[PDB]
Amino acid sequence: LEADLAELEAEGAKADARRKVRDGGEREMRQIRDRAQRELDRLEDIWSTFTKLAPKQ
């Protein structure tokens, strides 16, 4: 995303394209971190339901 923004700055495009590409990259990275925390909380639930486990569960 930073390289693409530098490219766009070099091409002298309007700030509309700057914000479009920046928002796209930001939302993609938000999705990446959200999925990473999805897996992290999956593992955390595994750990809780494993360590904190007893019959009748």
Side-chain angles (χ1 to χ4, degrees), residues 1-49:
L1 184 62
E2 200 284 340
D4 299 329
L5 293 180
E7 170 192 353
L8 197 63
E9 179 183 2
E11 308 308 334
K14 304 307 303 183
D16 297 327
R18 295 185 66 268
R19 275 199 285 273
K20 286 152 54 180
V21 178
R22 181 171 169 182
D23 183 11
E26 287 168 346
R27 291 294 84 88
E28 171 52 25
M29 290 183 293
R30 292 319 82 74
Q31 298 150 31
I32 295 165
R33 187 181 290 94
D34 291 328
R35 296 181 309 93
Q37 285 298 342
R38 283 180 214 171
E39 311 317 325
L40 199 159
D41 63 55
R42 288 278 291 272
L43 295 171
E44 195 171 11
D45 299 327
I46 295 290
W47 190 241
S48 183
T49 58

